[PDB]
Amino acid sequence: STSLSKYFPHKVLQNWTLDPELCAQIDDILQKFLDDNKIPWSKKGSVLEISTKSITWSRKARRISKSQTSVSSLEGQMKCELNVIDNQLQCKWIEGYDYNVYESFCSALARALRDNKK
RNA sequence: AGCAUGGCCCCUGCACAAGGAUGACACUGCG
Protein backbone atom coordinates (compact mmCIF):
# COMPACT_ATOMS: atom_id res chain seq x y z
CA SER A 1 0.00 0.00 0.00
CA THR A 2 2.92 2.31 -0.81
CA SER A 3 2.32 6.01 -1.38
CA LEU A 4 5.39 7.50 -3.08
CA SER A 5 2.98 9.45 -5.33
CA LYS A 6 0.79 10.88 -2.57
CA TYR A 7 0.19 14.06 -4.58
CA PHE A 8 1.34 13.19 -8.12
CA PRO A 9 -1.26 13.50 -10.88
CA HIS A 10 -2.92 10.10 -11.12
CA LYS A 11 -5.06 10.80 -14.23
CA VAL A 12 -3.00 10.54 -17.42
CA LEU A 13 -5.55 9.18 -19.96
CA GLN A 14 -8.49 11.44 -20.75
CA ASN A 15 -11.41 9.89 -22.63
CA TRP A 16 -14.48 11.34 -24.36
CA THR A 17 -17.37 9.30 -25.74
CA LEU A 18 -18.32 10.15 -29.32
CA ASP A 19 -21.66 9.82 -31.11
CA PRO A 20 -21.85 9.09 -34.86
CA GLU A 21 -21.77 12.77 -35.90
CA LEU A 22 -18.80 13.38 -33.61
CA CYS A 23 -17.05 10.27 -34.96
CA ALA A 24 -17.61 11.69 -38.44
CA GLN A 25 -16.41 15.26 -37.79
CA ILE A 26 -13.61 14.46 -35.34
CA ASP A 27 -10.91 15.13 -37.97
CA ASP A 28 -12.02 18.61 -39.03
CA ILE A 29 -12.72 19.56 -35.41
CA LEU A 30 -9.23 18.41 -34.39
CA GLN A 31 -7.44 20.14 -37.24
CA LYS A 32 -9.30 23.39 -36.59
CA PHE A 33 -8.55 23.26 -32.87
CA LEU A 34 -4.87 22.46 -33.35
CA ASP A 35 -4.16 24.94 -36.16
CA ASP A 36 -6.29 27.81 -34.79
CA ASN A 37 -4.11 27.71 -31.65
CA LYS A 38 -0.80 27.10 -33.45
CA ILE A 39 -0.27 23.79 -31.67
CA PRO A 40 2.64 21.64 -32.95
CA TRP A 41 1.55 18.17 -33.97
CA SER A 42 2.45 15.31 -36.27
CA LYS A 43 1.10 11.92 -37.31
CA LYS A 44 2.77 8.93 -35.67
CA GLY A 45 0.70 6.26 -37.38
CA SER A 46 -2.83 5.72 -36.07
CA VAL A 47 -2.04 8.33 -33.42
CA LEU A 48 -1.38 12.06 -33.22
CA GLU A 49 1.54 13.49 -31.25
CA ILE A 50 1.23 16.99 -29.76
CA SER A 51 4.45 18.57 -28.48
CA THR A 52 3.96 22.01 -26.96
CA LYS A 53 6.63 24.27 -25.51
CA SER A 54 4.16 26.82 -24.08
CA ILE A 55 0.43 27.22 -23.55
CA THR A 56 -0.97 28.98 -26.60
CA TRP A 57 -4.71 28.34 -26.28
CA SER A 58 -5.43 29.83 -22.85
CA ARG A 59 -7.21 33.14 -22.34
CA LYS A 60 -4.21 34.04 -20.21
CA ALA A 61 -2.03 33.15 -23.20
CA ARG A 62 -4.12 35.39 -25.45
CA ARG A 63 -3.82 38.25 -22.96
CA ILE A 64 -0.04 37.74 -22.76
CA SER A 65 0.42 37.64 -26.54
CA LYS A 66 -2.02 40.32 -27.74
CA SER A 67 -0.47 42.55 -25.06
CA GLN A 68 3.09 43.84 -25.27
CA THR A 69 4.46 42.19 -22.11
CA SER A 70 8.07 42.20 -20.93
CA VAL A 71 7.96 38.39 -21.16
CA SER A 72 5.93 37.28 -24.19
CA SER A 73 5.65 33.59 -23.24
CA LEU A 74 3.99 31.32 -20.67
CA GLU A 75 6.25 28.31 -21.10
CA GLY A 76 5.84 24.71 -19.95
CA GLN A 77 6.53 21.76 -22.22
CA MET A 78 4.29 18.74 -22.70
CA LYS A 79 3.73 15.82 -25.08
CA CYS A 80 0.54 13.84 -25.54
CA GLU A 81 -1.04 11.30 -27.88
CA LEU A 82 -4.47 11.61 -29.49
CA ASN A 83 -6.28 8.45 -30.51
CA VAL A 84 -9.73 7.10 -31.34
CA ILE A 85 -10.54 3.64 -29.99
CA ASP A 86 -13.95 2.16 -29.15
CA ASN A 87 -15.81 5.28 -30.29
CA GLN A 88 -13.80 7.22 -27.70
CA LEU A 89 -11.36 10.07 -28.22
CA GLN A 90 -8.33 9.52 -25.98
CA CYS A 91 -5.60 11.94 -24.97
CA LYS A 92 -2.69 10.30 -23.16
CA TRP A 93 -0.09 12.46 -21.43
CA ILE A 94 3.25 11.00 -22.54
CA GLU A 95 5.91 13.59 -21.57
CA GLY A 96 6.25 16.51 -19.15
CA TYR A 97 6.42 17.44 -15.48
CA ASP A 98 3.68 20.10 -15.31
CA TYR A 99 0.25 18.44 -15.23
CA ASN A 100 -1.51 21.80 -15.44
CA VAL A 101 -0.54 22.33 -19.07
CA TYR A 102 -1.84 18.88 -20.01
CA GLU A 103 -5.11 19.33 -18.13
CA SER A 104 -5.43 22.82 -19.64
CA PHE A 105 -5.08 21.30 -23.11
CA CYS A 106 -7.65 18.66 -22.21
CA SER A 107 -10.16 21.24 -20.99
CA ALA A 108 -9.75 23.31 -24.16
CA LEU A 109 -10.11 20.21 -26.33
CA ALA A 110 -13.28 19.23 -24.49
CA ARG A 111 -14.65 22.73 -25.06
CA ALA A 112 -13.84 22.40 -28.77
CA LEU A 113 -15.75 19.12 -28.88
CA ARG A 114 -18.82 20.68 -27.28
CA ASP A 115 -18.68 23.78 -29.51
CA ASN A 116 -18.04 22.49 -33.02
CA LYS A 117 -20.69 19.78 -32.47
CA LYS A 118 -23.56 22.02 -31.30
C1' A B 1 -20.81 9.38 -7.59
C1' G B 2 -22.03 13.21 -1.50
C1' C B 3 -19.73 17.50 1.30
C1' A B 4 -15.32 20.11 1.91
C1' U B 5 -10.42 21.75 -0.85
C1' G B 6 -8.36 22.90 -5.60
C1' G B 7 -7.30 24.11 -10.10
C1' C B 8 -8.79 23.70 -15.44
C1' C B 9 -11.53 25.50 -20.53
C1' C B 10 -14.68 30.18 -21.52
C1' C B 11 -16.26 35.82 -20.12
C1' U B 12 -15.13 40.76 -17.47
C1' G B 13 -10.36 42.57 -15.94
C1' C B 14 -3.35 46.82 -17.57
C1' A B 15 -0.71 43.60 -13.37
C1' C B 16 -2.07 41.50 -8.85
C1' A B 17 -6.82 40.55 -7.49
C1' A B 18 -12.08 40.09 -7.51
C1' G B 19 -16.18 38.32 -9.74
C1' G B 20 -19.45 35.61 -13.58
C1' A B 21 -20.70 31.38 -16.46
C1' U B 22 -20.20 26.54 -17.59
C1' G B 23 -18.64 21.73 -18.65
C1' A B 24 -15.04 18.37 -18.26
C1' C B 25 -12.19 17.29 -14.04
C1' A B 26 -9.00 16.32 -10.17
C1' C B 27 -4.66 16.21 -5.98
C1' U B 28 -6.34 14.78 -0.32
C1' G B 29 -9.79 15.15 3.84
C1' C B 30 -14.74 13.56 6.36
C1' G B 31 -13.74 7.60 5.84
DSSP states of chain A as a string?
A: ---S-SSS----EEEEE--HHHHHHHHHHHHHHHHHTT--EEE-SSSEEEEEEE--SSHHHHHHHHTT-SS---EEEEEEEEEEETTEEEEEEEE-S-HHHHHHHHHHHHHHHHHTT-
Number of domains in chain A: 1
> Solved how?
X-ray
**In-domain check, residue A6:** no
Answer whether any strand B atom is within 7 A of the Cβ of A117. no
Range of the domain at A34: 13-115
| Cα radius of gyration (chain A) | 15
Assigned domain for A1 exists: no
In a domain, A7, yes or no: no
Please indicate, yes or no, if residue A8 is contained in any of the structural domains: no
Which amino acid does the sequence have at A111? R
* Angle at CA of residue A57, ends A11 and A46, nearest 5°: 60
Q: Is the CB of A107 under 7 A from strand B?
A: yes
Q: In strand B, which positions have an atom below 7 A from any protein CB? A: 7-15, 23-28
- The CATH number that applies at residue A105 is 3.30.310.80
Residue A81 contacts by C-beta under 8 Å, 6 or more apart in sequence? A44, A47, A48, A49, A50, A90, A91, A92, A94
